[PDB]
Symmetry: C3
Amino acid sequence: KKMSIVLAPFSGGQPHSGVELGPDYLLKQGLQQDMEKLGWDTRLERVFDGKVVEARKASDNGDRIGRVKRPRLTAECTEKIYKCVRRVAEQGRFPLTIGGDHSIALGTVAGVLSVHPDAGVIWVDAHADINTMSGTVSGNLHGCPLSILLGLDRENIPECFSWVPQVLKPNKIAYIGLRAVDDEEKKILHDLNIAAFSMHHVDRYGIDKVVSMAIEAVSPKGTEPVMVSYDVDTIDPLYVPATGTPVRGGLSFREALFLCERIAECGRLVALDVVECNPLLAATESHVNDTISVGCAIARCMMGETLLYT
Amino acid sequence: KKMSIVLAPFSGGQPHSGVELGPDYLLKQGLQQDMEKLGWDTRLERVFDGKVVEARKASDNGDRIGRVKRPRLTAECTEKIYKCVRRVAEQGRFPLTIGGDHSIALGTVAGVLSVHPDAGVIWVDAHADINTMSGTVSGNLHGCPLSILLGLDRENIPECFSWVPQVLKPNKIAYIGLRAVDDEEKKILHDLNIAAFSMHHVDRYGIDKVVSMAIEAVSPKGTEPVMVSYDVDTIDPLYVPATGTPVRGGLSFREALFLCERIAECGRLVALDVVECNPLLAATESHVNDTISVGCAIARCMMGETLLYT
Amino acid sequence: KKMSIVLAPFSGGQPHSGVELGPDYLLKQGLQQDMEKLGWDTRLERVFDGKVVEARKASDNGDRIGRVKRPRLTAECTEKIYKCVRRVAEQGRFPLTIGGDHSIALGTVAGVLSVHPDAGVIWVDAHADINTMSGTVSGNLHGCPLSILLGLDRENIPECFSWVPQVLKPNKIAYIGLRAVDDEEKKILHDLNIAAFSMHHVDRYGIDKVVSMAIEAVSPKGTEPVMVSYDVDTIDPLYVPATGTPVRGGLSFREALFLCERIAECGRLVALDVVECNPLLAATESHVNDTISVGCAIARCMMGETLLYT
Ligand SMILES: N[C@@H](CSCC[B-](O)(O)O)C(=O)O
Ligand SMILES: N[C@@H](CSCC[B-](O)(O)O)C(=O)O
Ligand SMILES: N[C@@H](CSCC[B-](O)(O)O)C(=O)O
Ligand SMILES: [Mn+2]
Ligand SMILES: [Mn+2]
Ligand SMILES: [Mn+2]
Ligand SMILES: [Mn+2]
Ligand SMILES: [Mn+2]
Ligand SMILES: [Mn+2]
């Protein structure tokens, strides 16, 4: 029962700067003490200095490729997270990565699937994050990780991303909480028949059935390892206000945590990302604490914490 | 795929004046662009000038019949909406009427059922709006449309309402979201065995089962056209604050829209009313935008918009 | 159909003083008029003066036994509530007790089970309130009533509590809404196999199934009388803000009341406690009204009020 909290304070996948402060805020809330309190032998893994990275991030506007912003910086930092996560998993430890915007999942998923090729991926997000290099309108890379991981539109992916191992297939990723999918992304999920459970399915079937369907969708043999990449904006902005891309009509605080308890319950969780916490994008300090405490709650519930005896 | 957005800026069915500004606010939010964006060939239909109507509304206190307020003005304006909606439906276009208080449904339902006599009616509301002429305590006509449409207490309905065609029967109307029913109304729904699904049923069975039961209740042959008259106060005041009669414990933003997606999904929706938006009864501007954006969201979801590919 | 509203303005079971004002606030909201309006012949029963009790409560810090605070005062006042409630039930009236912190349930449950030994108990709370005398960390007695009622850790219960009749067994108590259970309490519910339905079960099965399971858990013959001890902090703080121990992720306003309607619906409710309303712990006056109105709503729904005809 060993764990490595991989710190990935990266904001190059999007415009707003506060998101790279996420790792520190979670740790200040006592994230590591909570994990140890849950019986986990933990250790921190700093992939790179967030200030040094943000210094180059906010200054280097020339880092572009058409509409795509900061492909170079993102490719570099993401490769490092990949190496770190890959290493943590090979050492037999559970990698719990804290972001940072969702572009870091390019390295986390790559790292985990490199050690666990049969691992399924449950993407908890209000967004599909699967825009292609030539299809993204905003050019914000935190909304394109899955396209790169799946090797879509390879005829347009930069050479600086050639390091990304092609280990994630479309039948091994399932979404939960979708409600702000771009038309290009819609076509993509449809053409590739990717298991996507929107807020419609949650409202229609209830969170429990959706989580079960999501686990089943990526676990054919019913024995595969499972990884969860958790974007906090999946949770309704009234619970998680401090985030870059909030979308109305998300999961309630209860569903957000119940989902974690159901996953932890299956016992095959092998990795977890908690991304998009941005303390700066908070109206009041109650917005900060409410968002950061949610990040730690997700971790605790994912990692074993229950309401009753266990 | 032709549509006519019938503008019905009427507030004579209740005390507060801002409700007649609803049509303009929705259109300012881009309601028509959204409908066209959904592939609808749309056109606007102005039934009457809202300012001219409100001028007479706020001044003519003498327009009364006992407890009943503004029966004359309501009868006149409502007959016009009836003629307009009837015309739009005969022209083969989908009439999407924006209010305005709910007294406008006297003309919308009358107009639609006059062209589609087998059409079922789903009344989404926190209230039953079925008080009789001699039974209403407030005298606000927006809470009596269904009594007049059903021909209840005819022995007390004014001659100025004699224009209302008797085309709606009790087994063709189903409620969703009820939670503020007057005792007289309770007796009525019971005696007439009207399909009424309260917040109790939503809490008990879930929104999906309730919508299904509501569609089935008014669609015996399973092929009848369906009309939805949507009062925004059905949605909990914390999502739709700018409204005249808010009632605690309503539908969540998600259920409010999921209901629309389920209806649009059956493919037999033939008309839609979106009523009771009152921008003036908003604490802040965030209350206005939150309420008006909800009105447009209902329209989009009712008219075909989905979270995933379709 | 006779009822006695037992007033129990006690705050000695916890630190904050405003909770003893609950009874008065509910009554000011028209609690008694509501009950009579529901056809109940009601009468008030004042067990003791709240000011006199609070005067001694806030001054006598010496009233302690280790970590346990105010065991003497709590034992005395609680015995009185026991005598009063026992009397009301013997007179054939329904005892609706208003608190006051939850330590008053030591007298209410004792009083009711003394007349109805087969009565089941449904404890609606975010907390288990079953800490033992020697196991409580805070020493606040409102979090220990069930341990004393069940006769747990009797080897450590003070003589001033020897008056408590041992009439409640572990298979006759079922919880609903748990989400802040102490580790010692967890072990206890597990070892005694007490039916405990946490927010997990509500999120997993829905409120309706949970209420049904709770009623079944304490009603083996399916004919036993049922008593509900309702702690308002079970409801999410965003609906019930004015309370001493709010916990995030509670029941929605709708579930909180639906639960009441389902219970009232079985027809075997024999007693009800509505505890922990503290008007002083309110940010604004809207926090007060929102909390107090909830208390009265619980009463109305428990006592027969429905959304439709009945
Ligand atoms: N469709 C948008 C969404 S980006 C969402 C990023 B994330 O899911 O990590 O908040 C885009 O491509 O900019
Ligand atoms: N029972 C009330 C309710 S009026 C409700 C109007 B509407 O449902 O359109 O907000 C009355 O008769 O005044
Ligand atoms: N575990 C805490 C909880 S006390 C809860 C009291 B009440 O459920 O009535 O709000 C303790 O022993 O102080
Ligand atoms: Mn994301
Ligand atoms: Mn997102
Ligand atoms: Mn209405
Ligand atoms: Mn209404
Ligand atoms: Mn309690
Ligand atoms: Mn409690």
